[PDB]
Design a protein around this ligand. Structure first.
Ligand SMILES: OC[C@H]1O[C@H](O)[C@@H](O)[C@@H](O)[C@@H]1O
Ligand SMILES: [Ca+2]
Length: 135
């Protein structure tokens, strides 16, 4: 049930998991919880989500607590401000270290406790099968 958009395939889950058990599910399928890198991707994701909440690849990294992507895409703080619900991330209860798509809007993301169970979205690039490019 992977959906295709601009060079990547996406899996919207049918069963909810904690953030980390969602990521392990993605990894078992050669993917990761999704990063979000453009307005058009954010639009594809929140529209497809259809008002349900889904874990995405947002999680804290470093001692400063900077947001990061689990698929190792460098996190662009400046260009991601436009993507959080107003007021977020708010670290409610000093315990919200993972992020989801919550609101069906370009301003969609919420920080939530990593141990909460939600549906989730994996991403993986299309990688053609081709003979070795070394030679
Ligand atoms: O009011 C927003 C607030 O709602 C609940 O408390 C949780 O979803 C928080 O993560 C969120 O920031
Ligand atoms: Ca929050």
């Amino acid at each position: 049930g992977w959906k295709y958009f601009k060079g990547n395939f996406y899996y919207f889950s049918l069963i909810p998991k904690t953030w980390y058990s969602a990521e392990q599910f993605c990894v078992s399928r050669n993917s990761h919880l999704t990063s979000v890198t453009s307005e058009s991707e954010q639009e594809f994701l929140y529209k497809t989500a259809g008002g349900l909440i889904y874990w995405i690849g947002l999680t804290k990294a470093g001692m400063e607590g900077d947001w990061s992507w689990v698929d190792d895409t460098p996190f662009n703080k400046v260009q991601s401000v436009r993507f959080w619900i107003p007021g977020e991330p708010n670290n409610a209860g000093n315990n919200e270290h993972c992020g989801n798509i919550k609101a069906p809007s370009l301003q969609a993301w919420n920080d939530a406790p990593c141990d909460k169970t939600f549906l989730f979205i994996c991403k993986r690039p299309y990688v053609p099968s081709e003979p070795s490019a070394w030679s």
